[PDB]
Amino acid sequence: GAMGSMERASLIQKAKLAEQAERYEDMAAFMKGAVEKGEELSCEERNLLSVAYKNVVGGQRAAWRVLSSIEQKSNEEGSEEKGPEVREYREKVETELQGVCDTVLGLLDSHLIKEAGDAESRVFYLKMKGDYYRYLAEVATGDDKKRIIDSARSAYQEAMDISKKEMPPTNPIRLGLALNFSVFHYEIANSPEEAISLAKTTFDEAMADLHTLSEDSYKDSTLIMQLLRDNLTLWT
C-alpha cells in the first residue's frame, strides 16, 4: 500500500513516534504497513497494532454514540423535523467505523491468525477478532446482526478455549479476554447473568494464582482484575 516502500523496522519506529505524539491514525497506518510485510509480529508489535486501532475505533465509537443519541432524540414525539442531516452524518461516521473494523478483521484474516501458533499470539488475535466484531455489532441493525454477533461470540469462545488450556489464570491476555467477553455478554448478547458469572469466576481464579507471581506480574494482573471488579460493581 502507501507503506509498501518503507522498511518494516522504520514503520515500527514511526508507530512508536506516532504513539508519543498521540497521532493514532498515523500509528494505525504504520502498523498496518508493518503487518502487510508478511512477517509475524512480536509481542511488542502486537501491542502497538492493538493500541493504534483501539484508539482510532474508540474515538469513532464515542462520536457514533453522541450522534445516535441526537438521532434518537429527534425521533421522539414533539421533536421538530430537522431533515436528513443527523441520520446522514451518523451514517457517515458509522460507515467509517465499519471500515476500520473491516480493515482490522482483514489483517487478522490475511494472515495474522493462520500464522499464530503460540497461545500468546493466537489468543491475542482471536480476542481482537471478537472485539472488532463486537464493535460491528454495536452499530448493527440489519439482517446480518445475528451473524455479526455470532462471529464475535465464536472468536471469543475459541480464544477462551485456548487460554484456559494454555495460560495461567493470571495471564493478562487471558484476563483481558475474559473481561471483554463478559462485556460482550452484558452489552451485546443480552446475557447479563453470563457476564456476571464469567467476571466472578475469572476474578476468583486469578486471585487464587497471584501467589505464584513476581511483584511486577502481580501488578499487571491485579490491574485487570480491578476492571473485572469495576464491571461487577456496575452490574450488580
Binding site: 452484558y186 452489552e187 476492571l227 452490574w235
Partner: peptide, 6 residues
C-alpha cells in the same frame, strides 16, 4: 458509567 473493556 459504561462497561469497561481493555
Amino acid at each position: 458509567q459504561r462497561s469497561t473493556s481493555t
